[PDB]
Design an enzyme around this catalytic site. Structure first.
Site, PDB file in Angstrom:
ATOM      1  N   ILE A   1      40.802   6.688 -53.582  1.00 34.57           N
ATOM      2  CA  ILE A   1      41.087   5.903 -52.410  1.00 34.57           C
ATOM      3  C   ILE A   1      40.568   4.949 -51.826  1.00 34.57           C
ATOM      4  O   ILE A   1      40.439   4.801 -51.023  1.00 34.57           O
ATOM      5  CB  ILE A   1      42.611   6.764 -51.664  1.00 34.57           C
ATOM      6  N   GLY A   2      39.129   5.011 -51.291  1.00 33.87           N
ATOM      7  CA  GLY A   2      38.167   4.650 -50.685  1.00 33.87           C
ATOM      8  C   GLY A   2      36.764   4.741 -51.141  1.00 33.87           C
ATOM      9  O   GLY A   2      35.879   5.499 -52.088  1.00 33.87           O
TER      10      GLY A   2
ATOM     11  N   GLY B   1      33.043   6.905 -49.208  1.00 38.25           N
ATOM     12  CA  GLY B   1      31.768   7.776 -48.383  1.00 38.25           C
ATOM     13  C   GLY B   1      31.001   6.838 -48.174  1.00 38.25           C
ATOM     14  O   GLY B   1      30.668   5.517 -48.366  1.00 38.25           O
ATOM     15  N   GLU B   2      30.130   7.482 -46.872  1.00 43.43           N
ATOM     16  CA  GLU B   2      28.426   7.508 -47.178  1.00 43.43           C
ATOM     17  C   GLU B   2      27.593   7.409 -48.605  1.00 43.43           C
ATOM     18  O   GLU B   2      27.156   6.302 -48.678  1.00 43.43           O
ATOM     19  CB  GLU B   2      27.712   7.890 -45.737  1.00 43.43           C
ATOM     20  N   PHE B   3      27.781   8.330 -49.767  1.00 43.08           N
ATOM     21  CA  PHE B   3      27.006   8.308 -50.924  1.00 43.08           C
ATOM     22  C   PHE B   3      28.117   9.164 -51.236  1.00 43.08           C
ATOM     23  O   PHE B   3      27.580  10.270 -52.393  1.00 43.08           O
ATOM     24  CB  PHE B   3      25.962   9.226 -50.193  1.00 43.08           C
ATOM     25  N   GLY B   4      29.600   8.592 -51.531  1.00 45.06           N
ATOM     26  CA  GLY B   4      29.986   8.963 -52.741  1.00 45.06           C
ATOM     27  C   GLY B   4      31.816   8.661 -52.940  1.00 45.06           C
ATOM     28  O   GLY B   4      31.976   8.138 -51.293  1.00 45.06           O
ATOM     29  N   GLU B   5      32.908   8.839 -53.694  1.00 44.99           N
ATOM     30  CA  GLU B   5      33.285   7.807 -53.124  1.00 44.99           C
ATOM     31  C   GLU B   5      34.799   9.022 -52.558  1.00 44.99           C
ATOM     32  O   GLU B   5      34.485  10.717 -52.333  1.00 44.99           O
ATOM     33  CB  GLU B   5      34.610   7.876 -54.783  1.00 44.99           C
ATOM     34  N   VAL B   6      35.574   8.583 -52.207  1.00 47.81           N
ATOM     35  CA  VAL B   6      37.167   9.225 -51.663  1.00 47.81           C
ATOM     36  C   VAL B   6      38.066   8.993 -52.493  1.00 47.81           C
ATOM     37  O   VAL B   6      38.468   8.243 -52.924  1.00 47.81           O
ATOM     38  CB  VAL B   6      37.082   8.200 -49.964  1.00 47.81           C
TER      39      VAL B   6
ATOM     40  N   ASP C   1      35.612   4.836 -32.702  1.00 49.42           N
ATOM     41  CA  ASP C   1      36.648   4.083 -33.526  1.00 49.42           C
ATOM     42  C   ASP C   1      37.076   4.092 -33.436  1.00 49.42           C
ATOM     43  O   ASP C   1      38.595   3.673 -34.650  1.00 49.42           O
ATOM     44  CB  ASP C   1      35.333   4.098 -34.463  1.00 49.42           C
TER      45      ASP C   1
ATOM     46  N   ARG D   1      43.560   1.613 -37.432  1.00 49.72           N
ATOM     47  CA  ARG D   1      43.190   2.122 -39.374  1.00 49.72           C
ATOM     48  C   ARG D   1      42.292   3.428 -39.773  1.00 49.72           C
ATOM     49  O   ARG D   1      42.795   4.033 -40.375  1.00 49.72           O
ATOM     50  CB  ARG D   1      42.143   0.994 -39.409  1.00 49.72           C
ATOM     51  N   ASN D   2      42.279   3.980 -37.979  1.00 51.42           N
ATOM     52  CA  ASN D   2      42.205   5.060 -38.760  1.00 51.42           C
ATOM     53  C   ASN D   2      43.135   6.528 -37.318  1.00 51.42           C
ATOM     54  O   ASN D   2      42.456   7.247 -37.722  1.00 51.42           O
ATOM     55  CB  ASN D   2      40.687   5.442 -37.397  1.00 51.42           C
TER      56      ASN D   2
ATOM     57  N   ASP E   1      38.648   9.219 -38.555  1.00 52.28           N
ATOM     58  CA  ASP E   1      38.070   8.198 -38.664  1.00 52.28           C
ATOM     59  C   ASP E   1      36.996   8.257 -39.978  1.00 52.28           C
ATOM     60  O   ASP E   1      36.739   9.772 -40.694  1.00 52.28           O
ATOM     61  CB  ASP E   1      37.124   9.179 -37.903  1.00 52.28           C
TER      62      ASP E   1
HETATM   63  C1  LIG Z   1      38.288  13.261 -46.606  1.00 50.93           C
HETATM   64  C2  LIG Z   1      38.250  13.051 -45.219  1.00 50.93           C
HETATM   65  C3  LIG Z   1      37.186  12.761 -45.062  1.00 50.93           C
HETATM   66  C4  LIG Z   1      36.746  12.929 -43.337  1.00 50.93           C
HETATM   67  C5  LIG Z   1      37.785  12.270 -42.558  1.00 50.93           C
HETATM   68  C6  LIG Z   1      37.591  11.988 -41.146  1.00 50.93           C
HETATM   69  O1  LIG Z   1      39.072  11.788 -40.535  1.00 50.93           O
HETATM   70  N1  LIG Z   1      36.394  12.904 -40.490  1.00 50.93           N
HETATM   71  C7  LIG Z   1      36.620  12.483 -39.029  1.00 50.93           C
HETATM   72  C8  LIG Z   1      35.293  12.524 -38.711  1.00 50.93           C
HETATM   73  C9  LIG Z   1      34.542  12.525 -37.419  1.00 50.93           C
HETATM   74  C10 LIG Z   1      35.933  12.798 -35.895  1.00 50.93           C
HETATM   75  C11 LIG Z   1      36.550  12.801 -36.497  1.00 50.93           C
HETATM   76  C12 LIG Z   1      38.199  12.796 -35.909  1.00 50.93           C
HETATM   77  F1  LIG Z   1      38.878  14.624 -36.254  1.00 50.93           F
HETATM   78  F2  LIG Z   1      37.994  13.065 -34.655  1.00 50.93           F
HETATM   79  F3  LIG Z   1      39.571  11.645 -35.740  1.00 50.93           F
HETATM   80  C13 LIG Z   1      37.283  12.845 -38.661  1.00 50.93           C
HETATM   81  C14 LIG Z   1      39.422  12.126 -42.956  1.00 50.93           C
HETATM   82  C15 LIG Z   1      39.340  12.299 -44.399  1.00 50.93           C
HETATM   83  N2  LIG Z   1      40.484  11.699 -44.938  1.00 50.93           N
HETATM   84  C16 LIG Z   1      41.444  10.820 -45.171  1.00 50.93           C
HETATM   85  N3  LIG Z   1      40.296   9.730 -45.979  1.00 50.93           N
HETATM   86  C17 LIG Z   1      41.065   8.804 -46.517  1.00 50.93           C
HETATM   87  N4  LIG Z   1      39.923   7.929 -46.834  1.00 50.93           N
HETATM   88  C18 LIG Z   1      38.774   7.342 -45.788  1.00 50.93           C
HETATM   89  C19 LIG Z   1      38.370   6.006 -46.389  1.00 50.93           C
HETATM   90  C20 LIG Z   1      39.616   5.188 -46.595  1.00 50.93           C
HETATM   91  O2  LIG Z   1      39.485   3.740 -47.687  1.00 50.93           O
HETATM   92  C21 LIG Z   1      40.620   6.260 -46.841  1.00 50.93           C
HETATM   93  N5  LIG Z   1      41.589   8.782 -46.021  1.00 50.93           N
HETATM   94  C22 LIG Z   1      42.606   9.495 -46.441  1.00 50.93           C
HETATM   95  N6  LIG Z   1      44.561   9.329 -46.262  1.00 50.93           N
HETATM   96  C23 LIG Z   1      44.984   8.445 -46.793  1.00 50.93           C
HETATM   97  C24 LIG Z   1      46.150   8.722 -46.687  1.00 50.93           C
HETATM   98  N7  LIG Z   1      46.179  10.032 -46.295  1.00 50.93           N
HETATM   99  C25 LIG Z   1      45.871  10.605 -45.733  1.00 50.93           C
HETATM  100  N8  LIG Z   1      42.367  10.627 -45.733  1.00 50.93           N
END
Ligand SMILES: Cc1ccc(C(=O)Nc2cccc(C(F)(F)F)c2)cc1Nc1nc(N2CC[C@@H](O)C2)nc(-n2ccnc2)n1
Length: 272
Positions: free
Chosen positions: A19-20, A22-27, A134, A138-139, A152
């Site tokens: 679904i996306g 990361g810095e060095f790996g998939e989500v 940020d 979108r976040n 984030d």
């Molecule tokens: C796995 C994961 C790892 C980290 C974070 C995250 O927030 N870290 C963070 C870091 C600093 C501050 C804060 C905070 F808390 F202050 F804000 C939060 C969210 C997700 N979880 C996640 N990532 C994605 N991504 C990422 C790549 C995108 O394309 C899709 N999508 C969904 N997702 C979709 C539908 N239901 C859930 N969940």
């Protein structure tokens, strides 16, 4: 750092779809047994020391947060490779896409309620001395109760306060500027801030004193609040506590939201 985190055994985690990135790996979207759907960010073989520090440090701060309007960390895999950060999952997804796909489907009170939740999460982060940097629709994730969870996802001129752009001063007060942009995104159902203006044109307009115009059918109080988030002088902006208080009072006296700000039409239509 892994203090507030729960260590999850890899046999409890199933990855289903990318679904996306990361810095060095998939989500991934996947499933967690201890079954619940989860999002999974991996750190894959070959990651650097700095990447490992940032990855585990991220899990550590996420575990520290415990709030209704902040994404919940289910846990971490650190004892095995690949390492993983595992969070809750929302079928409704990110707020920007959600609103664009549901244009005009919500009441004013529902939209303002979303903003109150976002503001409560941001108040919590700011109180915890965490600067987001940020904040944008979108976040933000939306659950099936319409509750917004600040997140984030990793990488924004149009959302960023002037001092953060000009001299890299990121604080909870620059997050307040971004929150004002988020308010505009919510009330417009995900319109692009400043439409087709380029990044340079946006900054020039802001420096010249221009600000985003009222969304259509927007409560006067809500536009006044977003405008106060966009004060050039950082010290004059409301703190998140002020924003939460105002939004709570508006919701609790909902007739206050029936007075609408004038909308400036772009197009004239003459009819009899
Ligand atoms: C796995 C994961 C790892 C980290 C974070 C995250 O927030 N870290 C963070 C870091 C600093 C501050 C804060 C905070 F808390 F202050 F804000 C939060 C969210 C997700 N979880 C996640 N990532 C994605 N991504 C990422 C790549 C995108 O394309 C899709 N999508 C969904 N997702 C979709 C539908 N239901 C859930 N969940």
């Amino acid at each position: 750092v892994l203090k507030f985190t729960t260590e999850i055994h890899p046999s409890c985690v199933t990855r289903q779809k990318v679904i996306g990135a990361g810095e060095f790996g998939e989500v991934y979207k996947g499933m967690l047994k201890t079954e619940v759907p989860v999002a999974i960010k991996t750190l894959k073989a070959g990651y650097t020391e700095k990447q490992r520090v940032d990855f585990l440090g991220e899990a550590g701060i996420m575990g520290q947060f415990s709030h209704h309007n902040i994404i919940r960390l289910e846990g971490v895999i650190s004892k095995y490779k690949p390492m993983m950060i595992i969070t809750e999952y929302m079928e409704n997804g990110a707020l920007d896409k959600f609103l664009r796909e549901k244009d005009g489907e919500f009441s004013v009170l529902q939209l303002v309620g979303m903003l109150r939740g976002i503001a409560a999460g941001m108040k919590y982060l700011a109180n915890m001395n965490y600067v987001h940097r940020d904040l944008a629709a979108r976040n933000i994730l939306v659950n099936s109760n319409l509750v917004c969870k600040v997140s984030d996802f990793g990488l924004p001129i149009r959302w960023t306060a002037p001092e953060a752009i000009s001299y890299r001063k990121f604080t909870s007060a620059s997050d307040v500027w971004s929150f004002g942009i988020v308010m505009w995104e919510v009330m417009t159902y995900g319109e692009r801030p400043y439409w087709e203006l380029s990044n340079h044109e946006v900054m020039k307009a802001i420096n010249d004193g221009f600000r985003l115009p009222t969304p259509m059918d927007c409560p006067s109080a809500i536009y006044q609040l977003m405008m106060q988030c966009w004060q050039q002088e950082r010290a004059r902006r409301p703190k998140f506590a002020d924003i939460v208080s105002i939004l709570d009072k508006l919701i609790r006296a909902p007739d206050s939201l029936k007075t609408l700000a004038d909308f400036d039409p772009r197009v004239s239509i003459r009819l009899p």
